[PDB]
């Protein structure tokens with residue numbers, strides 16, 4: 001049973017919590033929390049989890065948001081089990097083969113113990129208590145050992161659980177025999193094609209593993225033999241973390257318009273990578289059975305799903321039996337004013353706007369559509385007295401974070417990039433978001449993308465978004481209307497409750 005110790009619900013949180021709880025108690029399979037940025041979606045989720053008293057899985061679109069959510073839930077539920085099911089995939093290199101460079105890359109070995117420790121802490125809690133909230137990136141949902149074996153194998157002071165998720169040795173001996181049978185069939189496949197390099201590679205690698213398994217009960221990359229350990233038939237879905245949860249667990253897909261497509265595309269993405277290792281003889285075809293689930297398989301293994309997003313995608317909108325909105329922010333801050341400005345003199349207009357703001361301690365974010373434009377605009381702004389940096393698309397998560405962190409701390413005043421839909425860009429000091437080529441085609445100028453971009457100006461009491469365009473596209477029109485709908489609802493709530501916005 002959960003014990004919430006966070007802030008009491010404010011703004012639209014009370015009504016949203018009640019609407020979600022009511023739909024779930026009524027048996028709705030799919031429900032959406034349509035929550036604007038800054039409305040406190042984590043507290044809403046927390047209160048729903050508390051009310052229903054069922055273990056929960058929260059999936060995030062990337063490792064940064066996953067870690068952040070885990071940290072927040074930990075603070076909100078200090079006496080319960082908050083777990084982070086991290087994957088080595090997030091920070092270390094997996095096994096891979098790059099054909100174009102005829103390059104084989106070994107998986108990183110002897111990694112930071114904290115990774116495996118977090119995964120085991122997750123599975124141990126799921127088997128010992130019901131007050132568990134597990135946060136993970138979607139990528140973490142992959143093949144994992146049989147929960148039955150993991151559960152049945154314990155030592156009893158203190159109950160000690162396994163040190164690995166791939167126990168199930170059944171008859172290691174009969175298991176090793178079945179793997180070797182596949183090996184020689186596959187070697188014959190290569191020999192018949194004249195591909196003796198592939199046959200040799202597969203033989204050496206597989207026989208090495210079989211010997212290490214025989215003399216150690218395990219080997220590096222043992223997960224590749226998952227199917228043999230779990231007894232699953234070829235092509236059948238593998239066991240995953242979902243199987244370690246009690247049957248009535250609740251699933252939240254945060255940033256659902258991003259996570260649902262990630263869940264839909266995971267199987268194919270992984271298949272392309274693994275199939276390559278198989279085609280060149282590094283792995284047996286059975287390695288393809290240690291994989292992510294297809295979206296349909298994932299849906300068969302969950303019972304109720306809450307999609308959370310400020311801009312729900314097509315799946316959520318077609319399938320949800322209820323949509324609950326949360327628009328009013330606990331802080332009372334308003335969605336920004338959105339202006340449309342001509343392209344003539346747009347750069348001089350923008351530079352004047354940026355310097356006016358920098359003079360009073362306010363920051364500006366700018367999105368453009370090409371790398372040449374981003375490079376050139378950034379240099380132009382710097383030559384004209386502005387502390388501007390360019391958020392290059394090749395920066396990795398840490399680098400982006402460091403660069404963004406420096407804006408949050410005020411080292412510079414303006415960040416220019418192509419894709420601003422990055423984590424950490426919700427900074428109170430940002431009072432202007434400028435969107436060049438606002439009317440042009442492309443993912444970053446879609447109705448949803450514009451709404452998400454506009455939201456980066458919603459943490460400041462004077463936030464504005466400037467759309468440079470000489471025409472209004474349907475995406476611009478609908479994003480401006482939605483921003484205005486939200487702002488008006490927020491102003492009405494503030495006027496009823498005697499609240500005047502302020503920047504923190």
Ligand SMILES: CCCCCCCCO[C@@H]1O[C@H](CO)[C@@H](O)[C@H](O)[C@H]1O
Nearest residue numbers: 184185187188190191192193194195
């Ligand atoms: C388990 C190991 C079995 C080894 C037997 C390999 C028989 C090879 O098979 C032969 O290979 C030739 C060259 O690739 C082809 O031209 C022939 O068509 C093919 O039958």
Ligand SMILES: CCCCCCCCO[C@@H]1O[C@H](CO)[C@@H](O)[C@H](O)[C@H]1O
Nearest residue numbers: 310311312313314317318447448482
């Ligand atoms: C309030 C948050 C709005 C986010 C943008 C939502 C855009 C939805 O767009 C709508 O989707 C429907 C079904 O998917 C279609 O039938 C409509 O024709 C389409 O306009």
